[PDB]
């Protein structure tokens, strides 16, 4: 009576902040064509994630392999038509939306995103889908997904050691070196981030509850072996809530690829995506999105229940699914 | 490259109905938005009607609203604009023009040639 | 209910001469906007969209300007083929609502 840090924890408490799935972010329901879907649908930004295809050498980033191209050949990105489009620079962004001030306001990442969310048909805008943004930091650009799958994986598609040789289209969500500087934003990505949501790792300092006055500690905890500050964030962002669940499957291969070649517009937007018909899957944001890592011992520590403090803890370093992997405040 | 050659129309009294077909030739309809825009002698266009690719939607300005009906065939390529409970004020050239795709720049690119509707007693 | 103001009503311009048609829109309109030229008895043909953007085939000689609530098409070296009807379209909100026209009569 009462807690003195609350205001600041705020940007802790994931089912508010972000209220959607961090590894699988499926959270709203669009139709596309005349089926329905489960498009991304979380306010926060996940520093760090992007998209492996397995048995590839080609980028997630790169335009989508339409036409004549064989579906591995390309990436989730949305087609290079019109340099002002996908990928665009942030000058390009500055210059594009020269002529509003509500927006002129906004921060690189959330621009992006609201450039993303701008290909509506204006009569139709009522619909609650957009093509999810990513952007990177460093190159600072900005690219269109013209897939908003995360994970095609499991048993007709994706089983271990695969008799299909490279050919099959298999992909899953991950947190690496080569995504580090990259962020993935969907249509409902709060424009107040800087303020609401978890962005760097809170060095120096450690995750517990706030309990009768004093900052106390984790009641359950999993404890895992961690090398670095990466491998930690990577466990956690695994353990984190995912709205498609482990191996999840229903649509034909042969059938999504054939749209690809005939240049489908709604088959590429809706490929491996799960239906709205089923709202269950929904992680709502709910599950083990928070870890903590003893540097000096090398152990990872996940949790299901959200943090409502931190300890001075020196040895320590509190991080979240969503958070940066390199990025780090000792600040306390 | 691109045809919308409209078909229908003509004349027809007040209260009654007519159907204007346009097929569309070219491009893979099914990713297209459609729309019709109608023209008043010495008149400005007026939007009439928005499909969307599957069709599962459609728009209508409140000018000729559920008294007007867009429709199309995506197997057979093809658009339609079941106009009902017509009035004089309806009297203009219907066009088919293909309407966007967000995300592209398709939008308004391509009109039928037009085709006059004649409404009076 | 987005008032297009697109004015004048019509406009005498000489050969080479710039012309200047001015669509002013209520409420927020982004980009969102479409010049078309309309020629008698025929289809109108997209000039300008995205509003600056020019359109496959339509000369440097078109091009469009935002600032504001105000837009506006430039013809600047005038020929005998802007002889026209020129009309604005706001694609951003629904209704799509367009502008009366601007009727273009070139000076002889």
């Known amino acids: 009576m009462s807690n003195p840090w609350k205001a600041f924890m705020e940007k802790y408490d994931l089912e508010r902040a972000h209220n959607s799935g961090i590894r699988i972010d499926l959270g709203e329901d669009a139709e596309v064509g005349n089926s329905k879907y489960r498009i991304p649908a979380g306010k926060c930004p996940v520093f760090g994630k992007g998209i492996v295809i397995e048995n590839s050498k080609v980028s997630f980033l790169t335009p989508v392999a339409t036409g004549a191209q064989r579906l591995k050949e390309g990436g989730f990105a949305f087609p290079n038509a019109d340099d002002h489009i996908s990928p665009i620079t942030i000058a390009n962004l500055k210059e594009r939306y020269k002529e509003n001030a509500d927006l002129m306001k906004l921060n690189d990442i959330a621009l992006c995103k609201t450039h993303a969310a701008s290909f509506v048909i204006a009569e139709d805008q009522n619909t609650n889908y957009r093509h999810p943004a990513v952007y990177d930091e460093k190159e600072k650009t900005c690219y269109m997904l013209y897939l908003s799958a995360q994970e095609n994986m499991g048993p007709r598609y994706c089983s271990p050691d695969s008799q299909n040789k490279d050919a099959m289209f298999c992909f899953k969500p991950d947190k690496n070196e080569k995504f580090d500087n990259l962020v993935y934003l969907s249509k409902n990505v709060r424009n107040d981030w800087e303020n609401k949501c978890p962005r760097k790792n809170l060095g120096n300092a450690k995750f517990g509850l706030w309990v009768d006055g004093n900052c106390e500690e984790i009641p359950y905890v999993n404890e895992v072996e961690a090398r670095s500050l990466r491998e930690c964030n990577r466990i956690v962002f695994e353990a984190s809530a995912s709205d498609q669940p482990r191996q999840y499957e229903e649509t034909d291969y042969e059938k999504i690829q054939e749209g690809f070649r005939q240049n489908n517009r709604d088959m590429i937007k809706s490929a491996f995506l799960p239906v709205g018909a089923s709202d269950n899957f929904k992680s709502k944001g709910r599950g083990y999105n928070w870890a903590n890592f003893d540097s000096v011992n090398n152990k990872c520590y996940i949790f299901n229940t959200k943090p409502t403090c931190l300890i001075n803890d020196k040895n320590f370093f509190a991080t979240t699914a969503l958070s940066h992997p390199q990025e780090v405040d000792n600040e306390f | 490259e691109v045809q919308l050659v409209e078909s229908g129309g003509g004349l027809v009294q007040p209260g009654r109905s007519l159907k204007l077909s346009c097929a569309a030739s070219?491009?893979?309809?099914?990713?297209?938005?459609m729309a019709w825009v109608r023209q008043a002698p010495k008149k400005g266009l007026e939007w009439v009607a928005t499909?969307?690719?599957?069709?599962?939607?459609?728009y209508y300005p409140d000018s000729v609203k559920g008294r007007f009906t867009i429709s199309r065939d995506n197997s057979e390529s093809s658009l339609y604009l079941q106009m009902n409970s017509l009035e004089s004020e309806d009297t203009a050239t219907y066009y088919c023009?293909?309407?966007?795709?967000?995300?592209?720049?398709?939008?308004?690119?391509?009109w039928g040639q037009g085709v006059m509707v004649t409404v009076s007693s | 209910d987005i008032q297009m103001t697109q004015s004048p009503s019509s406009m005498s311009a000489s050969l080479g001469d710039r012309v200047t048609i001015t669509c002013q829109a209520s409420?927020?309109?982004?980009?969102?906007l479409i010049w078309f030229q309309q020629k008698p008895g025929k289809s109108p043909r997209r000039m300008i969209y995205?509003?600056?953007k020019l359109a496959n085939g339509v000369p440097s000689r078109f091009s469009g300007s935002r600032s504001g609530s105000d837009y506006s098409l430039t013809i600047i070296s005038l020929e005998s083929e802007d002889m026209a009807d020129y009309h604005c379209?706001?694609?951003?909100?629904?209704?799509?609502?367009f502008g009366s026209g601007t009727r273009l009569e070139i000076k002889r």
């Open positions: 995205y509003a600056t």
């Open positions: 409420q927020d309109i982004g980009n969102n």
């Open positions: 499909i969307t690719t599957s069709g599962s939607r459609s």
């Open positions: 070219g491009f893979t309809f099914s990713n297209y938005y």
């Open positions: 023009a293909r309407r966007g795709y967000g995300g592209y720049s398709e939008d308004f690119d391509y």
């Open positions: 379209l706001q694609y951003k909100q629904f209704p799509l609502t």
